[PDB]
Amino acid sequence: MLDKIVIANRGEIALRILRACKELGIKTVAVHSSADRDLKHVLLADETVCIGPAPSVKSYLNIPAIISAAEITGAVAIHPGYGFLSENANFAEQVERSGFIFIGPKAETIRLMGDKVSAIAAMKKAGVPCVPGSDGPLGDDMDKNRAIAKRIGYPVIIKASGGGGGRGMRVVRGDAELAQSISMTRAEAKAAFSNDMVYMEKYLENPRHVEIQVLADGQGNAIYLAERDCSMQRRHQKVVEEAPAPGITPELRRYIGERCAKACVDIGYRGAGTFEFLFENGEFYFIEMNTRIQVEHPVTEMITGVDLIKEQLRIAAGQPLSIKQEEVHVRGHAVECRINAEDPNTFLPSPGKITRFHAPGGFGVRWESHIYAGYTVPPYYDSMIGKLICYGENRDVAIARMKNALQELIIDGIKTNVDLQIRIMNDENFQHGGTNIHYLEKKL
Amino acid sequence: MLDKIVIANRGEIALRILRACKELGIKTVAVHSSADRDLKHVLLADETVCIGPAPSVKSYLNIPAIISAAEITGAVAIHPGYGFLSENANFAEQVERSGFIFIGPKAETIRLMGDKVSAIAAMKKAGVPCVPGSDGPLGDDMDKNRAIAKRIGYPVIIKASGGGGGRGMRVVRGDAELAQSISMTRAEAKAAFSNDMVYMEKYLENPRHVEIQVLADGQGNAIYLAERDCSMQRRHQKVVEEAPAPGITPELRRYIGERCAKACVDIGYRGAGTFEFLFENGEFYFIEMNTRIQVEHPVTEMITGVDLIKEQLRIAAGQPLSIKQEEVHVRGHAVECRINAEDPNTFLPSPGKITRFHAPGGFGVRWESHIYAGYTVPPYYDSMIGKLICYGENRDVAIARMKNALQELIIDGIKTNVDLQIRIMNDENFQHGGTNIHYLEKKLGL
Numbered sequence: 001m002l003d004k005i006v007i008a009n010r011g012e013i014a015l016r017i018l019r020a021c022k023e024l025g026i027k028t029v030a031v032h033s034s035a036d037r038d039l040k041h042v043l044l045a046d047e048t049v050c051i052g053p054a055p056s057v058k059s060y061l062n063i064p065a066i067i068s069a070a071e072i073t074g075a076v077a078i079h080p081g082y083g084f085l086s087e088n089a090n091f092a093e094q095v096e097r098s099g100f101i102f103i104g105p106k107a108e109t110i111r112l113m114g115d116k117v118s119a120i121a122a123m124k125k126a127g128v129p130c131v132p133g134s135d136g137p138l139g140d141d142m143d144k145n146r147a148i149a150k151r152i153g154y155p156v157i158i159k160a161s162g163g164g165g166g167r168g169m170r171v172v173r174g175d176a177e178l179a180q181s182i183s184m185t186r187a188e189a190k191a192a193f194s195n196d197m198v199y200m201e202k203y204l205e206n207p208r209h210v211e212i213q214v215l216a217d218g219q220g221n222a223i224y225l226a227e228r229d230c231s232m233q234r235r236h237q238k239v240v241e242e243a244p245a246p247g248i249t250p251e252l253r254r255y256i257g258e259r260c261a262k263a264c265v266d267i268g269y270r271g272a273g274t275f276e277f278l279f280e281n282g283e284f285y286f287i288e289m290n291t292r293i294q295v296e297h298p299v300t301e302m303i304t305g306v307d308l309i310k311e312q313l314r315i316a317a318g319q320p321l322s323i324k325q326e327e328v329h330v331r332g333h334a335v336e337c338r339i340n341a342e343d344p345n346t347f348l349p350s351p352g353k354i355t356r357f358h359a360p361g362g363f364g365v366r367w368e369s370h371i372y373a374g375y376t377v378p379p380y381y382d383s384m385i386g387k388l389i390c391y392g393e394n395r396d397v398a399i400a401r402m403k404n405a406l407q408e409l410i411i412d413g414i415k416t417n418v419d420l421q422i423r424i425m426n427d428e429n430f431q432h433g434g435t436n437i438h439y440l441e442k443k444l
Numbered sequence: 445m446l447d448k449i450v451i452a453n454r455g456e457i458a459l460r461i462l463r464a465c466k467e468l469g470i471k472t473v474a475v476h477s478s479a480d481r482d483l484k485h486v487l488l489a490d491e492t493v494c495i496g497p498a499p500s501v502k503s504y505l506n507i508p509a510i511i512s513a514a515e516i517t518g519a520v521a522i523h524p525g526y527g528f529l530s531e532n533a534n535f536a537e538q539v540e541r542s543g544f545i546f547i548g549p550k551a552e553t554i555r556l557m558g559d560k561v562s563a564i565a566a567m568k569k570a571g572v573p574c575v576p577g578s579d580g581p582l583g584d585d586m587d588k589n590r591a592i593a594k595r596i597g598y599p600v601i602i603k604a605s606g607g608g609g610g611r612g613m614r615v616v617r618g619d620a621e622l623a624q625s626i627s628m629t630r631a632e633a634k635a636a637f638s639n640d641m642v643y644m645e646k647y648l649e650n651p652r653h654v655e656i657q658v659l660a661d662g663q664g665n666a667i668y669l670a671e672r673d674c675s676m677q678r679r680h681q682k683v684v685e686e687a688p689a690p691g692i693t694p695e696l697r698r699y700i701g702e703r704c705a706k707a708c709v710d711i712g713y714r715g716a717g718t719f720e721f722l723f724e725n726g727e728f729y730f731i732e733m734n735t736r737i738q739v740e741h742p743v744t745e746m747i748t749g750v751d752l753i754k755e756q757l758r759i760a761a762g763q764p765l766s767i768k769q770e771e772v773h774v775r776g777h778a779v780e781c782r783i784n785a786e787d788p789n790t791f792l793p794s795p796g797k798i799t800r801f802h803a804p805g806g807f808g809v810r811w812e813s814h815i816y817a818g819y820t821v822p823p824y825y826d827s828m829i830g831k832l833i834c835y836g837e838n839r840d841v842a843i844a845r846m847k848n849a850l851q852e853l854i855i856d857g858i859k860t861n862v863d864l865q866i867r868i869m870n871d872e873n874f875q876h877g878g879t880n881i882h883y884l885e886k887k888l889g890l
């Protein structure tokens with residue numbers, strides 16, 4: 001087992017990783033910005049290294065500071081969490097070349113599957129259905145862009161190849177808006193991701209977002225761990241996730257899961273990852289592979305019993321897969337509500353001091369957050385401050401449980417989306433299940 | 445069926461019951477003392493009724509006030525939780541006589557099995573091995589009392605028939621301490637339980653405390669839900685509980701579980717309950733049946749997936765058991781640490797205002813408590829303020845989770861036993877498993 005690791009992240013995921021480390025007796029190094037000294041996991045970590053001032057560009061994206069932190073503490077591995085450098089092939093490469101284990105896929109796999117244009121190309125090559133699109137980067141020729149749009153059929157969406165969290169995405173309904181949309185998306189993607197490559201994809205009218213969790217050891221064994229439905233979204237970012245996906249039958253589950261496990265073996269995938277699909281009229285269409293842990297991984301944990309972070313760590317230690325496919329069993333249902341520090345109605349950021357906090361508790365309730373009363377939410381990072389996950393023997397119980405937990409959850413001093421999450425749980429169509437990716441913004 | 449119930453209790457268990465009701469759409473009436481207006485479950489309840497001033501004898505033991513609360517709100521059932529009036533046959537009778545459902549066994553069953561002298565007699569009648577003892581109440585004849593102690597062999601223990609929480613129990617090493625030990629336990633039992641009846645039991649030197657969770661519908665169906673080891677103890681009261689019990693083999697689990705389920709059917713048991721045993725040399729010896737929910741019920745919930753409170757309510761509504769025996773599956777391991785507002789060294793109660801509170805979290809971490817920052821723990825009640833329960837795929841993972849969760853738990857402003865629980869989890873002998881009921885006080889030097 002890994003002796004010591006740097007947790008190259010912050011907030012809830014850094015604490016999630018710290019806990020898994022502690023259970024496995026792995027020493028922890030928390031690297032943090034000067035704004036994050038009072039993070040719960042920083043205070044719990046065995047060692048801490050300040051890697052720069054508050055802006056992410058100067059700290060959490062500071063590759064040489066993070067790699068140096070591993071050297072100064074004698075760590076043997078680095079866990080990137082999600083976001084930040086986790087899908088950055090350059091970082092993965094540099095980690096390995098400095099003598100450290102990168103807790104994730106090989107750098108070449110991150111280039112293959114992390115970049116969204118080449119992932120689509122790879123999946124098409126593999127015989128995995130994708131969404132019709134430009135099948136390559138858009139150039140500057142507007143006649144050519146219009147011609148691609150016409151071939152696939154309006155509406156379309158301009159998507160950043162390096163995009164994440166729904167940033168760098170713009171829907172286009174017709175020719176008149178195409179140029180300014182491609183131009184704006186490029187500018188957003190260049191700013192957020194230092195990568196102005198965009199592609200075009202057909203905008204699907206009625207799909208659900210359904211994704212399959214995979215685990216592969218890099219030795220040729222791969223498994224799938226059921227699926228998740230993450231169709232409740234705002235600004236193309238997930239708000240609620242659940243597992244398993246409602247209406248997905250065992251026959252269909254195994255069909256898509258086997259395809260994902262096979263895809264892992266073929267490309268030589270290593271570690272945890274997720275294949276994300278649009279599910280429409282009984283068919284799955286590949287949109288993205290996250291070559292990293294998923295934010296919403298706890299719902300899969302609840303319904304399978306598998307600890308996905310521990311599996312990541314075991315795999316990084318060069319352990320083969322312990323779990324066989326036949327040993328994976330879906331039991332019950334879990335729902336996750338993201339908790340974000342933003343106005344529940346205007347959706348504008350609400351950083352600042354949390355004056356009162358109370359987490360919910362009870363049978364089947366899991367709270368995933370670094371926040372505490374007295375803690376200051378900084379302005380510099382993403383608004384997601386916590387995750388509430390409720391498990392039940394069935395979906396009705398899980399939702400009932402969530403409804404009650406959200407009523408017990410207190411976060412005062414800043415604005416949150418807790419009241420929005422309450423509204424979603426009370427929604428007749430969410431209760432029905434199988435609402436499409438456009439539903440939440442329709443409702444709102 | 446149950447559209448409104450009175451929660452006849454307080455603190456963590458009241459909140460536990462409330463949560464089950466909220467999930468089932470059951471309206472709640474929180475009865476409380478004047479010192480308990482700001483209890484979390486009171487604030488969350490649909491309706492609240494003040495049943496008396498601060499002392500328990502004037503509030504949570506106030507039978508007329510609790511029944512009046514049920515009457516005035518139009519409640520159909522009353523959950524007594526644990527402690528207080530949960531094992532009070534007179535209360536159960538009166539609740540039933542007044543036209544309400546008592547969420548628990550029939551009153552006759554409470555007097556048969558709640559009373560500890562009759563429970564032993566009943567179990568002996570049914571051919572279940574008990575610990576050798578007086579087999580009846582102790583009188584005032586000391587020549588007879590000494591004769592009993594001779595038959596069973598010192599050390600012996602004087603136990604209150606109405607006793608609970610380790611109160612009203614004294615170990616006797618020889619004839620020289622016998623008479624005053626009897627007199628003092630009588631006195632202690634009289635003041636604490638309004639019952640001076642005491643009996644004598646052989647004091648077992650190397651047993652473990654292993655208990656079997658049961659559920660029965662009162663319609664003839666009865667099941668056991670594996671077992672719990674509760675051997676970490678101070679002053680004869682549980683400090684740490686875990687499930688399943690280490691080193692209990694499948695043949696032993698079914699042997700004892702089947703006996704307990706049969707006993708339920710035979711006495712017409714209804715609801716949740718626990719048969720408590722001393723386990724030594726591969727043999728079980730019955731000591732107590734709790735005719736009510738256990739404090740440590742969550743460890744069994746985590747390894748079986750069964751919601752025990754919801755089952756109590758279902759049974760109380762007249763529904764048959766939701767599960768057959770062949771459907772009970774044990775998966776993983778769970779450990780519970782009780783959290784008490786007390787000096788971690790001397791164990792003197794530590795009431796007062798909680799100035800800072802932070803609860804642990806994560807995969808497999810379950811925190812069961814009403815406490816919050818700004819909350820004042822009153823001097824009037826039992827010191828237990830919360831329970832931390834950690835589940836894992838195996839015992840090692842559960843313990844490792846508990847270590848981590850204990851490091852996260854912040855309760856400032858009052859003394860707690862958090863530091864004790866940390867020491868227990870770090871104990872190598874505990875980590876191996878199977879330590880006996882005397883181990884913790886041995887470790888501490890008590």
Ligand SMILES: Nc1ncnc2c1ncn2[C@@H]1O[C@H](COP(=O)(O)OP(=O)(O)O)[C@@H](O)[C@H]1O
Pocket residue numbers: 082083084087162163164165166193237238290293294295296382
């Ligand atoms: N390629 C990327 N580059 C930078 N940040 C990213 C990237 N992908 C995701 N993120 C960020 O990571 C966090 C989690 O991503 P999100 O899409 O919300 O969850 P997930 O993809 O795990 O369901 C968000 O703050 C998001 O903006």
Ligand SMILES: Nc1ncnc2c1ncn2[C@@H]1O[C@H](COP(=O)(O)OP(=O)(O)O)[C@@H](O)[C@H]1O
Pocket residue numbers: 131157159163164165166167201202203204205209233236237276278287288437
């Ligand atoms: N071609 C499409 N048609 C309709 N909706 C889409 C399409 N592509 C993406 N979306 C919606 O936007 C969300 C974010 O897109 P995704 O490609 O996963 O970007 P990110 O890398 O930012 O997560 C998806 O979950 C889906 O609901």
Ligand SMILES: Nc1ncnc2c1ncn2[C@@H]1O[C@H](COP(=O)(O)OP(=O)(O)O)[C@@H](O)[C@H]1O
Pocket residue numbers: 526527528531606607608609610637681682734737738739740826
């Ligand atoms: N027969 C009884 N009468 C009054 N109080 C009781 C009785 N039995 C238990 N209690 C109280 O109930 C609480 C829980 O009991 P305890 O013995 O700690 O848990 P359990 O028996 O559920 O493992 C304690 O405060 C204890 O003093």
Ligand SMILES: Nc1ncnc2c1ncn2[C@@H]1O[C@H](COP(=O)(O)OP(=O)(O)O)[C@@H](O)[C@H]1O
Pocket residue numbers: 575601603607608609610611645646647648649653677680681720722731732881
């Ligand atoms: N005969 C005995 N010999 C040794 N230890 C005992 C005996 N009876 C009880 N104990 C210890 O004292 C604890 C409390 O006894 P119990 O009869 O369960 O009383 P209570 O009603 O207070 O829970 C038990 O859990 C056990 O560890």
Ligand SMILES: [Ca+2]
Pocket residue numbers: 276288
């Ligand atoms: Ca995505």
Ligand SMILES: [Ca+2]
Pocket residue numbers: 087114163164288289290291
């Ligand atoms: Ca991605």
Ligand SMILES: [Ca+2]
Pocket residue numbers: 720732
């Ligand atoms: Ca007992």
Ligand SMILES: [Ca+2]
Pocket residue numbers: 531558607608732733734735
């Ligand atoms: Ca009892």
Ligand SMILES: [Cl-]
Pocket residue numbers: 011376377378385
């Ligand atoms: Cl934050």
Ligand SMILES: [Cl-]
Pocket residue numbers: 454455456458459483484485486814
């Ligand atoms: Cl409460």
Ligand SMILES: [Cl-]
Pocket residue numbers: 455820821822828829
């Ligand atoms: Cl209290």
